[PDB]
Amino acid sequence: ACGXGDGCAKXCAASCAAS
């Protein structure tokens, strides 16, 4: 659930699901 574009978020927020 993350476009993974420029300035994207890493970890539990977009890049990762945390859970």
Side-chain angles (χ1 to χ4, degrees):
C2 204
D6 204 305
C8 216
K10 63 151 277 205
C12 197
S15 296
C16 319
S19 192

